[PDB]
């Protein structure tokens, strides 16, 4: 249900999980997820143009190899070379990894200390000191260096993080 609509709409396409969602340039509203083996263009993770519209992309997302282990996703830039498109996107795994992707090209992986990570934000903090800040269900949190997927701090108990 949107503001501007006020009505209970059903999502036409038949999904399992909705890792990521949000507005992008030229698209207006978008969801990530799936419906129901190592080819980069195959991916298994359908984009979905919101308002019961076309899938919009089944082209250069994460491999189906990772589709069995990822739980949450967080995008960090979206390009449009032609009708196609190009995303640098972070995922994270049931197996305590944090990953970099570019066109579903896995690079710069980190190994999380703690068990069962939950979500991630980005911290800017100025000139060349950029960080992904990762939450867990276990009431603990990480901040990993960007540049070098490399843990910077690992605090614990953490009722909340902002």
């Amino acid at each position: 249900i949107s503001s501007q609509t006020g009505k209970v709409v059903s999502v036409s396409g038949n999904f399992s999980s909705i890792q990521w969602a949000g507005e992008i340039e030229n698209l207006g509203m978008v969801l990530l997820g799936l419906k129901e083996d190592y080819a980069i263009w195959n991916t298994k993770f359908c984009v979905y143009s919101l308002e019961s519209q076309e899938v919009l992309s089944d082209i250069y997302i994460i491999p189906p190899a990772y589709s069995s282990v990822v739980t949450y996703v967080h995008i960090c830039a979206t390009e449009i070379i032609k009708n196609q498109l190009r995303i640098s996107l972070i995922a994270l795994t049931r197996k305590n990894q944090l990953i970099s992707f570019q066109n579903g090209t896995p690079k710069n992986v980190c190994q999380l200390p703690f068990g069962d990570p939950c979500a991630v934000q980005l911290m800017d903090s100025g000139g060349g000191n950029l960080f992904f800040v990762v939450s867990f269900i276990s009431n603990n949190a990480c901040a990993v260096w960007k540049e070098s997927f490399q843990v910077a701090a690992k605090w614990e108990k953490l009722s909340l993080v902002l």
Binding site: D37, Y38, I40, P63, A65, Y66, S68, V69, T93, K95, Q97, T105, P106, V109, Q111
Partner: protein, 124 residues
């Protein structure tokens, strides 16, 4: 993607060898532990996928390359390497629990099924 990993290994292997053949006492060690960590990360990257019959050959290949390089720089073995072997073995079986000895017995019967990775296994 298998391409890239294969590629990165091979790259790192040649890096390793070049440091070995060539070099200064320092710069050798620099490129060595460089490639070591490379192999770690490639290890971790694959250690992050479920089982994967096609990946196994490289997996086992990779970890060997590590242990060898690891232990050689260390100039001595340790039991972390036995655990690395334990892990990779458990993965092999997960494709098709108790201790190293039953694992190997069950392993060599699963290989006598002739999945084509034996080149690594005898290596292991």
């Amino acid at each position: 993607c298998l391409d890239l990993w294969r590629e990165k290994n091979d790259r790192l292997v040649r890096q390793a060898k070049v440091a070995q053949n060539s070099g200064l006492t320092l710069r050798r060690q620099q490129l060595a532990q460089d490639a070591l960590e490379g192999l770690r990360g490639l290890l971790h990257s694959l250690q992050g996928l479920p089982a994967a019959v096609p990946v196994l050959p490289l997996e086992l290949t990779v970890t060997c390359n590590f242990i060898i390089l690891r232990a050689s720089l260390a100039q001595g073995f340790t039991e972390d390497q036995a655990q690395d072997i334990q892990r990779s073995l458990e993965r092999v079986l997960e494709t098709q629990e108790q201790g190293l000895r039953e694992l190997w017995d069950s392993v060599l019967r699963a290989s006598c099924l002739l999945p084509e990775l034996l080149s690594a296994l005898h290596r292991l």
